[PDB]
Unconditional design. Structure first.
Lengths: 124, 124
């Protein structure tokens, strides 16, 4: 049984642009692959920020990126998070928890929009 | 050259104003006003979380929404956050901290803005 007791904190990577902004260096296809293996995690409690939130999903695979949005438009900050995994295995394993119950509330997890809003084909 | 279709349109942002995920996106202008009051907080490390992060910005105004994205595909888990305030006063006060040091590292804060490509749901 391995348990992280402090340490392991190392985020000293800024790239150094001083104008980083919203993006990260990914090609259009890096972006497609990540959303294909991304999930939407909604109605998450404000208590489950990135560290706690990843832990639950990390059991289903390896996380590549995560985006968490909290709206106080509702007075109470609600959380929605998009978890983007490294593998397709992980997304499929995560979506299986779609209607699981977490912290007393039922959360919802489904892929970050892989649906057909009409015709969709990479090559036509 | 073979041109089956003459395509000339404008590049509209997808994340933020379009994809709110499964929920239906709130008003277009609610979205505009929030961007106009939004800041980009980058280089925030994985050690900070939403509560801690809000506290620093809450000192400079009232937060309406926040979006935090952490990338770990680079191996190192990094953080970027978009803080959306309720007042324009707050965004201006927050951007004044563009050069500052938080948790021992220099972060970068400047205004954030998304836009919509068009939102419609076809019934039948």
């Amino acid at each position: 049984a391995i348990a992280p007791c402090m340490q392991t904190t190392h985020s000293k990577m800024t790239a150094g642009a001083y104008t980083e902004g919203p993006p990260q260096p990914l090609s259009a296809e890096e972006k497609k692959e990540i959303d294909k293996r991304s999930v939407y995690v909604g109605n998450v409690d404000y208590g489950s920020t990135a560290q706690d939130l990843e832990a639950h999903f990390s059991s289903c695979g390896s996380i590549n990126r995560i985006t968490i949005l909290c709206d106080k438009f509702s007075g109470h900050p609600k959380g929605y998070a998009y978890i983007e995994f490294a593998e397709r295995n992980s997304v499929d394993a995560a979506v299986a928890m779609d209607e699981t119950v977490f912290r007393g509330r039922t959360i919802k997890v489904l892929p970050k929009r892989t649906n057909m809003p009409g015709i969709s084909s990479t090559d036509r």
